[PDB]
Nucleic acid binder design. Sequence first.
DNA 1: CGTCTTATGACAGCCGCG
DNA 2: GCGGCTGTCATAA
Length: 905
Amino acid sequence: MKEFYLTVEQIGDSIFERYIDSNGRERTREVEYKPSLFAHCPESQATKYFDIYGKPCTRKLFANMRDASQWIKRMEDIGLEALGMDDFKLAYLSDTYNYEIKYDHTKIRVANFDIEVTSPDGFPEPSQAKHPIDAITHYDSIDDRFYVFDLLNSPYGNVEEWSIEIAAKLQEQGGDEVPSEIIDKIIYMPFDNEKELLMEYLNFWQQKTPVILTGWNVESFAIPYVYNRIKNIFGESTAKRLSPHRKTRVKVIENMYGSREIITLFGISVLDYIDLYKKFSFTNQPSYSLDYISEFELNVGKLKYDGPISKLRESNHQRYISYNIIDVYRVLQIDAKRQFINLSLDMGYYAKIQIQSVFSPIKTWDAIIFNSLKEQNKVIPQGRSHPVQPYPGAFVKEPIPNRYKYVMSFDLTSLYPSIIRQVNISPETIAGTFKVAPLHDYINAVAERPSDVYSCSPNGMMYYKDRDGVVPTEITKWVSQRKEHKGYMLAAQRNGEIIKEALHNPNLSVDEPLDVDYRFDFSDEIKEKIKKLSAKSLNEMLFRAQRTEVAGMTAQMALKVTCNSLYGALGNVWFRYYDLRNATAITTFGQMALQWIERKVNEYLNEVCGTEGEAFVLYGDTDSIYVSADKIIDKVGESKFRDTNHWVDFLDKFARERMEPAIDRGFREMCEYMNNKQHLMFMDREAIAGPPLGSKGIGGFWTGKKRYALNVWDMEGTRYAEPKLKIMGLETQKSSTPKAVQKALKECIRRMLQEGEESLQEYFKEFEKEFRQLNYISIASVSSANNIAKYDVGGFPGPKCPFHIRGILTYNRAIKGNIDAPQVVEGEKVYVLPLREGNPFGDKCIAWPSGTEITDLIKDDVLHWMDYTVLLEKTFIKPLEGFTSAAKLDYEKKASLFDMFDFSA
DNA sequence: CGTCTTATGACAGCCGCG
DNA sequence: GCGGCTGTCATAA
Ligand SMILES: [Mg+2]
Ligand SMILES: [Mg+2]
Ligand SMILES: [Mg+2]
């Protein structure tokens, strides 16, 4: 019964809105919106509207939006503030939906599709639409159907109708392996000519017009192509038929490098899935092709085909259509796992914004704050212009590069939101300034107490303790959501370790997986049924537990990033509530908060162990402390632990029963010293790390800031079945490191931390012997391809040319003149290999598009001229020199006086 | 959407240094 | 050849 918007659009002096009504049906309005803006007035003008600072405001109701828009600019030319929401879409949604929006996703039409274009000329540039669209697959979320639009006749070949019978069959049988779940859901429709195809597609589009349009590179390729191909054949107005309100606009996106053109479809919220992935996955990938992401996410990968893609419709039109269908389903499987579309809806309806505006945290928070203020009858300050200006951030401790045997970590929960809430930081809560002492003076508690009446930050800023703060109040509503979804995440993880422990000694009875909610710890009853369960049904349970973890991971990470984005926006010049005094007040409090508790943890552990002046905190970054636990184990004497798990149990209790209350009273004292509104500095225990008992193995090491590795047994409550490596910053964790090298360097680390020096040297030798045998794609570096043109000097490398860019210019030379081989695209990623002296190619390296094999017309030469020695040293040895140097180990056995004896037994 | 932030690392080109 | 500086590309928060 409760209605909600789908899309909202401003065109001239009218608001074009698509919504779902009281009876759950999709309809369209054209409301001539009467917008309101505000202005300062004298105190003898008692009204109900006030600005955030308390100053009285008068309401200005306009006839049209153009009038309101042109009132603003002739209020600036006099120098008078023009308060209010100037984005009239946000104003409308706030007016039309003055309540908590609850929505039904089954009545929201989500569509994803993909185009096929045979192009011998090369890449079919979406701006020119030079070649016929020979295939479209369109999935509708309301119908649950894959609509295939196949072209049988082009100037590139006449082809037979595609068979759903053949598509269903196994590749071994001669079939295509289109998943069985989507076989009954395909609507096939063949077409004799391109015009007909395109014609019915539009009719289909009008009847089933997308609310959300998604897919892989839809904004970048699909939409612009179908728009321009229709435009060039039928005319502008027919191409306008892609928009419900018949309005399209070419948008120019220009970054620090070049510029690209996309097309707005007024009345459709386009969420290109690749863009959801880059924003919400929190994984930098070597490639962003759908095949690559699919294999990473789902462990499937696509079936192969003979020859280049431009010859595929010719030779095998059957597979040609099947692949286009699979590709569309891939995105749906990825979303079924990651849930990025659900996330974007939950966010956009909560913020009361255009769904696409989820990509903009600034737009998001400006609407959240406006809507929170509007409820109190308050008026938002005008967006001012500001010069970009630097300001300070977090503290990071300079660790001593060494091995560290027993380590335990602690970390502040929602640091910046918690700081905002503790200090009551907000644009309207500012109280004034106090004279500041050097940051060190506060850390040791030797500076004078800043205030008795106000809440302070060591940057000199003051805040009201009694008043409620707008930023603190709204961000609170977000923090509790994160704790909920993180709780589910950890529980699914804890449940996974129980299951993995049951996989060690499994039964073999023909049974089914237990139906349970993985978001919650298993009861004693369920535990026992698991201990007597089959591997088949255990593997399914595990897969489902990990799917819940990922769903929880994604949920809470987005809630984390959006929260910290509010802080970030405080340091952004375009944010309505930009204020460096606030942004700095947050970060300086963090610096003090860490170093403060470092001192406190150092004091407590000294007294407790019976020593004085010993540094226990070895490292910290922003809001963490890494505690050396060696003295805590040594005082007991590890000779009193029966197994590894025994000493893990000891440290966990020591943390929870002894260190945490000592930390809690530490922060409590700091909350007093600053005179804050409320104590919110809570530190969760994270890692318990160390070598397996009675083994060689260094447990962990640090090379420098942001670079360390630990052998974790327990992470934040989860007690693993087998120890897991925590590696931060090291090459194993960078998308630029070759796939095989990441794998090898990790094994080196695993041996260092779990097994010791002899084990490491053993593996170094064997890897060094087998290196030359590895897949060339597995041993290639990855890098982004920015500013190719800048360094392109007539085909050759220019001054200051980066290694990977040189690689591209070499590639471009070797593929030249040949009609089409895969070109390298600006701003995208490339594989890079070194080449030995005197090769048939120009320079010393070669690069080519990532996630793909190089053209067969240049491959053999590359493989033959690879510089394995250079590649091994640069990517493997040099990084391993770093880890072993820091850990005070040798990866290679050093000359000894023992070398003069004969050992053969 | 193209208008969240800073801190900090490795590596490569370049250029000097009898 | 190594070290200082700068540009570029990465990650940890
Ligand atoms: Mg495709
Ligand atoms: Mg934290
Ligand atoms: Mg942290």
